[PDB]
Amino acid sequence: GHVARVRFYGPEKNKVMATTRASAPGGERLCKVVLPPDPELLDHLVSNG
Amino acid sequence: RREAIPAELLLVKEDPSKLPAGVLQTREQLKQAQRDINWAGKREQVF
Amino acid sequence: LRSRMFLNFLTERNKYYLNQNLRDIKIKANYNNFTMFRDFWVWSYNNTQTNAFNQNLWWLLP
Amino acid sequence: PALPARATAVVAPLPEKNYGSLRGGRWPFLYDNVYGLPVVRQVASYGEVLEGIRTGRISQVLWFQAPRAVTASAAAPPPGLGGPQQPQPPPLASPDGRCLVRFANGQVKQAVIPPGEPRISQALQQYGTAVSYIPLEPRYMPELAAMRARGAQEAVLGEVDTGAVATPVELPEDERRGAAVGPTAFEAVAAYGSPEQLAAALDDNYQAAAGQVAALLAEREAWVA
Amino acid sequence: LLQHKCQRCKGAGVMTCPACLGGGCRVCGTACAWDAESEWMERWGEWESRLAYYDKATGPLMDEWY
Amino acid sequence: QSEHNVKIFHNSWWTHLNIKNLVNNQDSEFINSAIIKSINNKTSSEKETMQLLLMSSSILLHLCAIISLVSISQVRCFVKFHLILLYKLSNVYNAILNQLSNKLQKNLGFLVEWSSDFITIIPENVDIYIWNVFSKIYRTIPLSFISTTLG
Amino acid sequence: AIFWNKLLDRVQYKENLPQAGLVGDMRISYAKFLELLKDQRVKRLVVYGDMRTAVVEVPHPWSASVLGHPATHPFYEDSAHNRVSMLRPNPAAPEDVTQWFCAEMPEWDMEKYRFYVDLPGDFWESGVLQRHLAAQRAEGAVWDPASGQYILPYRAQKKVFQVSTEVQLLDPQESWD
Amino acid sequence: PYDADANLGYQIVDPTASMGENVWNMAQVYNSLPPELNPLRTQHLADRGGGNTQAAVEAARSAFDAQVVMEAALLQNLEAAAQDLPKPHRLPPTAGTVACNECGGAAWGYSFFPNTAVMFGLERPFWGDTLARLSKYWNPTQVADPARTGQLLPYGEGGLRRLLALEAVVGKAPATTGRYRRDLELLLAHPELRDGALRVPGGWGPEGGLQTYLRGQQEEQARMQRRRDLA
Amino acid sequence: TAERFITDAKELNATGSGLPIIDGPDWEEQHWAALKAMSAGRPVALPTPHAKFGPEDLQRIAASGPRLEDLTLEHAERLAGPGQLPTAPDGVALAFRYIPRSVLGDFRQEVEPDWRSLPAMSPAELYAGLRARNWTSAHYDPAAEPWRLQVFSCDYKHTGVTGWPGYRVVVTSRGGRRRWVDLAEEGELVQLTEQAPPASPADIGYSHVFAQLYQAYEPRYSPEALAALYGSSSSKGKAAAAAAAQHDTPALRHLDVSYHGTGSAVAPGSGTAFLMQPSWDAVTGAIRWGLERSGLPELRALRDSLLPE
Amino acid sequence: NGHLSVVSNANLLTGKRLNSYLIYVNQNLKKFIQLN
Amino acid sequence: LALLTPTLLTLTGQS
Amino acid sequence: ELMRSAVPAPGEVPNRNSRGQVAEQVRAILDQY
Amino acid sequence: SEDSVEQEFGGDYSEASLEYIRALGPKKGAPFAEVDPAEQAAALPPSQAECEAAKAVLENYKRDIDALKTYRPSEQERAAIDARRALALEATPEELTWLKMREYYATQRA
Ligand SMILES: [Zn+2]
Ligand SMILES: [Zn+2]
């Protein structure tokens, strides 16, 4: 529960710009992540608020 | 000096009727197979 | 300091064994001080650096 | 030693057959031309082989092989970068799927099975049926192509004449392939020959050996100088 | 624009041998040299020896001492 | 956080060299098959319309690319410079062969060009020759096309 | 710097292909890569833009754990200048040291081979990476009410020479060729 | 080191001069080769004795240069794969893979047809599509019911034999690291080897690193012990 | 597969520098001359058994068929000779055993039909007809007539025009008649343990067909087997119930599956395979070989012009 | 899965070699001497 | 080439 | 220890120089004066 | 006894500096542009011991070669060699290989 919001971007929507909470290591940043084809990611995202 | 081998110890012995059903090929069939062999022989050159 | 430096260099070079005189010929060589065909070749190389024509110069070395 | 048999007759080829999996079967003999070996002529299908594996009636399954050309190995930089010659890649399994099936009752059949078929692979992994790869025969191994070529070029027997016999002799031991079947040089030249060439050849053969060892020692002494 | 790719392998030129996923496989390739995991540190030793030759990082200290 | 710097030296190192011929030990049919089979499979004489459309649009793409490139002034300067250099080299080679063949059959500057217009230096004879050769090459296209498309 | 450092990584993207741990013909086979992956020896995996090439980074065997083996640089020392160790005796299987537990070195203090591997055309639909991830991330701290404590179970700790894989993918649009 | 030729020369290369001058200086007298492979070091004696020293050196320099060219090829492949381009050097398959049978293993080609997917920028497949395809591939569906069709076991062969210690508490034992066991034990019997002053070469067998130092120590202490009593 | 070292005087006597290499025509064409002469009517030389046979075993072989030992030959080649090394007073030889390809007779794989003059069938029809013969499916019917499937793959794909991708199935039926199916285009990827059509009869490729072929050959177990297994309390009682249980295979009455490759008729490196696909690399290699044959003695003109130097 | 491609005739590479022969005999002889 | 692109986009596997 | 991240920080990652940066370092230290 | 380094340095240092020098490399070999001792030990030819052993074996060889010169074949030897010659006269390549393999397999079984 350190990530607050993710924003899918790109023309084919496989990069995300994750934003971290205040309790995260290093405070609040915006980090870009490139995603592999993992069909369990979205459940993990929603079931953690 | 040579040795001799019986000519019945060199040839197989079975009558086609002791075979499964469709194993024996007729002439109709066997000729079509030769036709396909020839056509496959000349196909690429012709094209 | 110098002893340690030489020590480490020696160890890493002598790892080789863990499985005339070159100097007198190396003192006689054409080196660019930091022989006119040499300067020609060097200039012509440094001028055609980007074009594919540069590759033609590569086959002009002994 | 009796010569091998040599008979000749008119034979009638058998009728051709279509087993579904293979076609052929017109060879009327029990042995082949190049080798003197019996020919397998019973054919086992795919479902038959599967059942013979499941019900234990099959013990060993053997595949033939193929040479695997040298450029298509990954164990060293490509040949063409100029490195030292790497020995030889292992051989492949037969791409055509030619296979021999050995039963428990001693029977031996042939079949066509692609290496890596799912059902057969699972069966062989589960029931532990013995699986083998038949090594390559010498006229097809890539390391003995030099010997095959030399055999196809050189003569089998050699030349010795005495003036009255002109005997076909074997080649020397250092290149005699098979065995001492016919006459050797010494026995021929001494049994149908004369002391002239006998003495000459013996002593100048000694001269050759002496020249060899003397050149060795002479270059040794030059090294000392 | 003129480059096209194989549509089965998607331009990899190579597919998997599934049996080797779960006296080896005779159908699939040959091992490489850095696969022998018992010879790793020896190869690295040779390579770092050969590399210590060219290495000109400590050049100025060796130069002043020379 | 440190700052990084531009690297201006023996950068890359692995591009100065063409090594394609060493790695393949030298010392594209699936492509066209798949293209044509796909446009056949998806969409009478409609396959012929689609195939002609494909070929026509491809050739036109290449031609448009070439013309648009050659329509930049500096590219025309590049072309002109190359033309005069090649002409002088041809002059040299032709002179050598002509003189030495004359011998063995007896047996058996640049700036005036580089600084002037180019259509006034070149005669019309060469334009007429190029046009004649082109005309003769492509004059059988109507009959060929007609006889192809009519079964 | 915060901005410029990023910009420069895109223009000069060719100077950043790994030229440190990769020396000669550094390929490994796909079977060997799978075998290393399944035993948790790979520290970082870097799939590349086209999804058909990876650079596998494997630590030197003595730099993998925090054993005090005297073939590594003395990073961490006692007051009496001895390298520290962190071995733990694995109560279930003594008499075999290769089955003991040990903490792993921080990744910035590691020596690493950087092998190159070509992945087959069906690497993603075969699910090998997915199985590995899903297994290695399915363990963590638990609450035991029989002892009323927070337990980090043994089957979630690293044995000797094992590390924790970090998978990273690259973006083709970050090249600016 | 500059006198024994152990390291490169005195002022052969300068980081701020030019590339051409530096390749000139390095191409001068086998400066690109280390001493071990420099042929001048050996060009004087090689004859009947072994017939090998000048052979086993040109047969090592060759392997060296092959390694270097292979490194160049690998880096060109990586630079092509950094973008989404197809790789220029097609290498043969390895121990876990077979060659594609549509192409021969030649992965791509040129075609004179413009490949519209690149021209319009549609060569990447939209993440959601791939997610759907995979999630439907890893979930085979059973429509029949084993009641009607008398199928008692899942698919496969030899299901009957398939149907018949503390690995659950402390995980499985890793079997790729047995070859180090011995050394580990030594590192527990001789704690003094963890001293910050020592730095052995490195390796695992009795021919490398720790065991070499240990054998040397025991052997030299025994030598000195025997030398104490004789006097 | 085991190799053997021979260090013995008499065995190195019958050896020399290595046994002879039995040679002749190629393994797949040894029977052409003999069969054409036999069809003409001439007398033909009779095959002589191998020199390691003797008269006692020809009685059994001509009667009850050959054994795996009757087919195995040996071959040995000599390493260093007599006076080369110690622990080897008169030489050392390496001997290994094998079976030659010639043991396979005049048998080959089924001939590629004439795909132009042969009736076709849609992939969906093959899929339905294979479901109707798959006893684990919801569409089984035990009144289906047998089918013989021959699955062909192309071999002249890269060397010669007209090559095709994918697979081609030849289905022969009870009438003796034949049809064919064209399974290019692997439709949609599915695992082998999958029973669900693909939402469109147009997404049936060879993945679904191979799924059905794999599932059709599942061995069926009667309920008594696992009844005696589960009901047995003892562990090795279960083991006996398992090792003793039997099964049946319905597919042996419905399907006959075979795999073939349509042989090629153009050697990949020959001259005619250059006219069919002209390339510049080909002409460079050709002129290089032509220099090798005719004008590599250019490097003899080398030595001849080194006369003045 | 598992693939089912079959070639009709296995390509035995029919149609210098001295070094192959020599390396073969060298490898085997070296294995022999290392057996003792 | 934009007319045929839906057709030619099966050689890549997309729609 | 239960509420610790295992994702370290952006800040507590110390610098480590390659060989080229080591060379640059010794040069910048020697030409310091 | 009395290793090399113990001579050039010896009592000029203790045992500490001697072990210091002993653990850094053999003396000065291939990495330092010199010639290895195991490299130099191959450039020398066979010395006089082996050459004299060869000369004595050569004396033996000439003795037995003239001894062979003094040989004449026995009675049945002529008939045996001539029978081999006759078989070789009526021999073809295939059948001669046949009898070669016959020889090898017969002696294999014995
Ligand atoms: Zn492909
Ligand atoms: Zn495999």
CA distances (Å), origin M103, targets D181, D211, G154, I96, M84: 8, 37, 69, 17, 14
Task: Please give the method by which this entry was determined.
Answer: cryo-EM
Answer for the pair H209, H216: CB distance below 8 angstroms, yes or no. no
Q: Which of D70, D81, D85, D86 to mutate to test the interface with F (most CBs of F within 10 A)?
A: D81
Distance, CA of H31 to CA of H2 (rounded, Å): 13
Q: Which of helix, strand or coil describes residue I5?
A: strand
Number of helices (H), then strands (E), belonging to chain A: the values are: 1, 4
Distance between Cα E25 and ligand 2 center (Å):
4
Distance, CA of I295 to CA of I288 (rounded, Å): 9
Distance, CA of I11 to CA of H157 (rounded, Å): 48
For residue H131, with 0-12 CB atoms within 10 Å meaning exposed, 13-18 middle and 19 or more buried, which class applies? Answer: middle
Residue appearing with tokens 């060097």: C42
The residue among H78, G130, G173, G53 whose CA lies nearest residue A36 is G130
CA distances (Å), origin I124, targets B40, I129, I178, I187, I198: 29, 8, 17, 11, 11
The residue among H38, C11, H8, E51 whose CA lies nearest residue M34 is H38
The sign one gets for the Cα dihedral A8, A14, A19, A21 is: positive
Contacts for G15 with CB less than 8 Å, ≥ 6 apart:
F7, F11, F12
The sign one gets for the Cα dihedral E33, E35, E36, E41 is: positive
Distance, CA of A43 to CA of I194 (rounded, Å): 26
End-to-end CA distance of chain L: 49
> What are the beta bridge partners of residue I77?
I94
Per-residue exposure over F80-102, b if at least 16 CB sit within 10 Å of its own CB, e if not: eeeeeeeeeeeeeeeeeeeeeee
Which two structure tokens, joined as six digits, stand for I211? Answer: 């799924």
Distance, CA of G123 to CA of E21 (rounded, Å): 11
CA distances (Å), origin H161, targets D117, I248, M28, M51: 22, 17, 66, 72
The residue among H73, B6, E20 whose CA lies nearest residue G126 is E20
Determine whether the interchain pair I61/D30 forms a contact, defined as Cβ–Cβ distance below 8 Å.
yes
Which residue type is seen at I164? Answer: W
The sign one gets for the Cα dihedral I204, I207, I213, I219 is: negative
Scanning F13-123, the segments in alpha helix (DSSP H) are: 20-23, 29-42, 47-70, 73-107, 110-114
The residue among G52, G49, I23, G135 whose CA lies nearest residue D151 is I23
CA-angle at D194, arms to D188 and D196, nearest 5°: 120
The residue among H187, H176, H195 whose CA lies nearest residue H211 is H187
Scanning chain G, the segments in alpha helix (DSSP H) are: 2-11, 30-38, 123-126, 128-136
For residue D8, with 0-12 CB atoms within 10 Å meaning exposed, 13-18 middle and 19 or more buried, which class applies? Answer: exposed
> What are the beta bridge partners of residue D61?
D101, D131
CA-angle at D54, arms to D49 and D60, nearest 5°: 60
CA-angle at H63, arms to H61 and H64, nearest 5°: 60
Distance, CA of D192 to CA of I281 (rounded, Å): 62
H or E segment and range at residue G114: strand G112-118
Distance, CA of D145 to CA of F12 (rounded, Å): 45
End-to-end CA distance of chain E: 58
The residue among A38, G3, F50 whose CA lies nearest residue K5 is F50
Starting from the edge strand earliest in sequence, which strands make up the sheet with I255-262, in order? I178-183, I167-172, I147-154, I255-262
Residue appearing with tokens 């963890």: H194
CA distances (Å), origin F119, targets E66, F113, F115, F123, H183: 68, 11, 13, 8, 85
Distance, CA of I62 to CA of D38 (rounded, Å): 9
Which two structure tokens, joined as six digits, stand for C36? Answer: 């006119």
Distance, CA of M1 to CA of M22 (rounded, Å): 14
* D181: chain M residues, CB-CB within 8 Å: 84, 87-88, 96, 99-100, 103
The residue among M104, H215, J11 whose CA lies nearest residue I22 is M104
> What are the beta bridge partners of residue G113?
G58
Q: For E27, how many CA atoms within 13 A lie in the half-sphere containing its CB?
A: 25
Which residue type is seen at I289? Answer: W
For residue E22, with 0-12 CB atoms within 10 Å meaning exposed, 13-18 middle and 19 or more buried, which class applies? Answer: exposed
**Is E32 annotated as contributing to ligand binding?**
no
Find the closest chain M residue to I15 by CA distance.
M104
Distance, CA of C16 to CA of D168 (rounded, Å): 59
Find the closest chain I residue to H154 by CA distance.
I193
The residue among G120, G127, G116, G129 whose CA lies nearest residue G52 is G120
Answer for the pair G17, H78: CB distance below 8 angstroms, yes or no. yes
Return the C-alpha torsion angle I78, I79, I82, I84, nearest 10.
170
Contacts for H207 with CB less than 8 Å, ≥ 6 apart:
C18
Distance between Cα E20 and ligand 2 center (Å):
5
**Is E20 annotated as contributing to ligand binding?**
yes
Q: From the CB of residue H53, how many other CB atoms can be counted at a distance below 10 Å? A: 18
Scanning I151-307, the segments in alpha helix (DSSP H) are: 206-216, 223-231, 235-244, 272-275, 280-290, 298-305
Which residue type is seen at D75? Answer: A
Distance between Cα D68 and ligand 1 center (Å):
20
Find the closest chain H residue to I222 by CA distance.
H150
H or E segment and range at residue D92: strand D92-93
The residue among H112, E57, I99, F66 whose CA lies nearest residue D133 is I99
Instruction: Report yes or no: D33 at the I interface, CB cutoff 8 Å.
Output: yes
H or E segment and range at residue D126: helix D118-127
Answer for the pair I44, D11: CB distance below 8 angstroms, yes or no. yes
Task: Give me the helix-helix angle, C36-47 and H19-26, nearest 10°.
Answer: 130
* C13: chain H residues, CB-CB within 8 Å: 6-7
Distance, CA of I21 to CA of D138 (rounded, Å): 7
Which two structure tokens, joined as six digits, stand for M93? Answer: 């390549």
Instruction: Report yes or no: L19 at the E interface, CB cutoff 8 Å.
Output: yes
Which two structure tokens, joined as six digits, stand for G20? Answer: 């440190």
The secondary structure of I21-41, three-state, reads CCCCCCCCCCCHHHHHHHHHC
Chains that touch K (3 or more CB pairs under 8 A): E, F, H
H or E segment and range at residue E43: helix E40-54
DSSP class of I120: B
Distance, CA of C43 to CA of C21 (rounded, Å): 33
Q: From the CB of residue D155, how many other CB atoms can be counted at a distance below 10 Å? A: 9
Answer for the pair D139, I21: CB distance below 8 angstroms, yes or no. yes
Q: Which of helix, strand or coil describes residue D114?
A: coil
Which two structure tokens, joined as six digits, stand for H145? Answer: 């019911």
Q: For F12, how many CA atoms within 13 A lie in the half-sphere containing its CB?
A: 11
Return the C-alpha torsion angle F123, F126, F128, F131, nearest 10.
-140
Phi and psi (nearest 5°) for H102?
-90, -65
Chains that touch C (3 or more CB pairs under 8 A): E, H, M
Q: For D51, how many CA atoms within 13 A lie in the half-sphere containing its CB?
A: 15
The residue among H103, B5, H187 whose CA lies nearest residue G82 is H187
Q: Which of helix, strand or coil describes residue D86?
A: coil
Which two structure tokens, joined as six digits, stand for I285? Answer: 């290699």
Q: Which of C8, C11, C14, C23 to mutate to test the interface with M (most CBs of M within 10 A)?
A: C14
Determine whether the interchain pair H127/A37 forms a contact, defined as Cβ–Cβ distance below 8 Å.
yes
Distance, CA of I248 to CA of I219 (rounded, Å): 6
Instruction: Report yes or no: I161 at the B interface, CB cutoff 8 Å.
Output: yes
Which two structure tokens, joined as six digits, stand for F126? Answer: 């060469």
Distance between Cα F29 and ligand 1 center (Å):
12
Specify the pairing of strand D17-18 against strand D8-9.
Answer: unpaired
CA-angle at F94, arms to F93 and F96, nearest 5°: 65
The residue among D88, G32, H93, G24 whose CA lies nearest residue E35 is G32
Q: From the CB of residue H147, how many other CB atoms can be counted at a distance below 10 Å? A: 7
Scanning chain M, the segments in alpha helix (DSSP H) are: 5-8, 16-22, 37-40, 48-69, 75-89, 93-108
* D81: chain G residues, CB-CB within 8 Å: none
DSSP class of M62: H
The sign one gets for the Cα dihedral D24, D27, D31, D33 is: negative
Answer for the pair D109, D39: CB distance below 8 angstroms, yes or no. no
DSSP class of F82: H
> What are the beta bridge partners of residue I96?
I75
Return the C-alpha torsion angle D127, D132, D133, D137, nearest 10.
-150
Instruction: Report yes or no: L8 at the A interface, CB cutoff 8 Å.
Output: yes
Distance, CA of H25 to CA of H27 (rounded, Å): 6
Q: Which of helix, strand or coil describes residue I88?
A: strand
The sign one gets for the Cα dihedral I298, I301, I305, I307 is: positive
Scanning H92-209, the segments in alpha helix (DSSP H) are: 116-119, 127-137, 159-163, 167-170, 181-189
> What are the beta bridge partners of residue M2?
none
Specify the pairing of strand G166-169 against strand G44-47.
Answer: parallel
Give me the residue from J6, J7, J32 closest to I5, CB to CB: J32
The residue among G161, G119, G157, G124 whose CA lies nearest residue G140 is G157
Task: Give me the helix-helix angle, H181-189 and H210-230, nearest 10°.
Answer: 50
- Chain centroid to Cα D122, Å, comes to 34
Determine whether the interchain pair H201/C31 forms a contact, defined as Cβ–Cβ distance below 8 Å.
no
CA-angle at D31, arms to D30 and D37, nearest 5°: 130
Per-residue exposure over H78-113, b if at least 16 CB sit within 10 Å of its own CB, e if not: bbbbbbbbbbebbbbbbbbbbbbbbbebebbbebeb
The residue among L12, I108, G169 whose CA lies nearest residue D23 is I108
Answer for the pair D16, B26: CB distance below 8 angstroms, yes or no. no
Contacts for H152 with CB less than 8 Å, ≥ 6 apart:
H146, I221, I223, I226
Find the closest chain D residue to E29 by CA distance.
D73
> What are the beta bridge partners of residue D23?
D18, I108
H or E segment and range at residue G150: strand G149-151
* L11: chain A residues, CB-CB within 8 Å: 26
The residue among H98, I264, G119 whose CA lies nearest residue D92 is H98
Scanning C1-62, the segments in alpha helix (DSSP H) are: 2-14, 22-26, 36-47, 54-58
Determine whether the interchain pair C34/H18 forms a contact, defined as Cβ–Cβ distance below 8 Å.
no
Phi and psi (nearest 5°) for F110?
-75, -20
Determine whether the interchain pair E27/D121 forms a contact, defined as Cβ–Cβ distance below 8 Å.
no
Q: Which of helix, strand or coil describes residue G47?
A: strand
Q: Which of helix, strand or coil describes residue D98?
A: strand
The residue among G84, G90, G58, G80 whose CA lies nearest residue G69 is G84
Answer for the pair M25, C17: CB distance below 8 angstroms, yes or no. yes
Which two structure tokens, joined as six digits, stand for M27? Answer: 């003396």
Scanning D3-59, the segments in alpha helix (DSSP H) are: 46-54
Distance, CA of C36 to CA of C45 (rounded, Å): 14
Q: Which of helix, strand or coil describes residue G80?
A: coil
Ligand nearest to the CA of I157: 1
H or E segment and range at residue D102: strand D98-103
Which two structure tokens, joined as six digits, stand for J12? Answer: 């035995």
Q: From the CB of residue D105, how many other CB atoms can be counted at a distance below 10 Å? A: 7
Q: Which of helix, strand or coil describes residue C10?
A: helix
Distance, CA of I255 to CA of D47 (rounded, Å): 9
Contacts for I13 with CB less than 8 Å, ≥ 6 apart:
D179, D180, M107
Q: Which of helix, strand or coil describes residue D132?
A: strand
